Amino acid sequence: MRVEGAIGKTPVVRLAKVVEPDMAEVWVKLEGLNPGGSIKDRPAWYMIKDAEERGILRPGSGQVIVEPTSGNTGIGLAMIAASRGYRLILTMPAQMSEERKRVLKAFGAELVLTDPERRMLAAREEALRLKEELGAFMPDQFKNPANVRAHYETTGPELYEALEGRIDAFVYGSGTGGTITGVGRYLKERIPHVKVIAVEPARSNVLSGGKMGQHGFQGMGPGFIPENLDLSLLDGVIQVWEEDAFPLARRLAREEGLFLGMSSGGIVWAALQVARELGPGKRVACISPDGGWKYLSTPLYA
Amino acid sequence: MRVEGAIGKTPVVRLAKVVEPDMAEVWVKLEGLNPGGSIKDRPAWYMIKDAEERGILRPGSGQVIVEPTSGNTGIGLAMIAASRGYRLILTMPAQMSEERKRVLKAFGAELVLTDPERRMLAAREEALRLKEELGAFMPDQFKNPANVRAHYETTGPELYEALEGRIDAFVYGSGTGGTITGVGRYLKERIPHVKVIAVEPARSNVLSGGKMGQHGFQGMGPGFIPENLDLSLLDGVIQVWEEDAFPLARRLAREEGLFLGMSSGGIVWAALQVARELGPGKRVACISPDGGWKYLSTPLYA
């Protein structure tokens, strides 16, 4: 078996200290236990495997893959490209932290640093330029249906089975929209009453009708509504503040032994709010995108 | 289920790029996929659970646990203490990196920084002083039989089953000795011909009859022979150099998509040597103690 085969089948733990007796049960699926360190291993593998199935790619070819990302998707793609023999080029703003660059380069990804003033826009442009110049494959994480399918076929089934089909609400901090859409559809097809609640940064609350903005929940809240996010599935949107989520993340680490990422703090905080609303006999499920390992030099744990 | 329940059941992957056709198969069990980030989650949980079973401890009591370590064992103990409600105090030399200190403190562990000139000796002394002053529980990782038992009851069975009882050699870089002893005994009781090979730093080659010394394989090669290491189980000892292991670790990341720790590079390098000796039709199994996540600021990935 190769590393891509070690993706998924992650555990779900029930919170016991940060919750209160008047709250519904709160379960957290730990996606940080994936070989690539995050939930993005799933869509990274699926988008590449989907491309192979469609004939766009064939493993061990050395073909080029390009994507404008320096986040978990970049790490996941880098891992898969290293394992299956693809040349990966990742475009990103020149102000990228050395720590993250080292992780990507460790996997053999080639990095193209773009105009720091043009932020994501310049990264996207360079990725498109390379796709055109090299005839490369661009996963296109925000609009590729295979992203959603990864969660519809693996994440969703896993969560449903682990919790024995007993879930009253699913809470998640949306990034590309793949997870909430894939898991959301899977759960709604089987649980008539289940509520699907999206979580976003109050500082970049576009789903709530607000405005995009800079925030500290790395990995979630892209500042726009992605094509992979099915808005018709949502039963609500909860806005979260770093001021509330970071202290909660620290509590999870010290009280539950759960050392999670920045987005996890926001997601669990929202899940707790939902848990109090539903009450004692209910079950709230949410997902932790990644662990705290990549964030020791951030205000969350610094 | 709580975090301690998410420990174990780690995957095993077969190397395909760094190996050569004249080599036996090489399988690597990924212990970095544990909630605490390393194989030490197992002995940390077992030593604490063993103490509870013997009546020394009872969860949620706030009882004190003290251990002289800042490594993976410290992280594992911190995670378990946070989850089960114990007060953990870790003693370590004052020259400890801020990164590691942040991980331990994130889990709520109390840190006592000792004389930087007295290295491990001062850390051990303070731990003993606290055990005496507070009547605290000290896991004593290098001599506690529960460490070995964790691997005899979980790691060993898992490896054996995953590889369908087909293993010609087991290779591991010994630290406390728990893993090689536990897995080693489990395998030898079932596979008459299996060879158990220990790996140690050439720079601190005490098992080979050499002398202790400073080295870069964090987590392995303690510079002494621990009580938990059963020397009668060993069929050989392979000495490894950072000069050879670090480049190999980088190859594993770039070619196999396996981003592993410093000790993993040394262990796999040794496993390859054994694989070439055994040849094509055989199977060599080894274990990766942890991932590369905690080592981005080390010469391995910097």
Ligand SMILES: *Cc1c(COP(=O)(O)O)cnc(C)c1O
């Ligand atoms: C990708 C990611 C998310 C969002 O998941 P999507 O399926 O992309 O919506 C949230 N947090 C982190 C840390 C992520 O990497």
Ligand SMILES: *Cc1c(COP(=O)(O)O)cnc(C)c1O
């Ligand atoms: C603990 C550890 C080892 C050794 O395992 P033992 O069972 O203690 O022999 C090797 N490498 C790392 C990184 C470790 O943390």
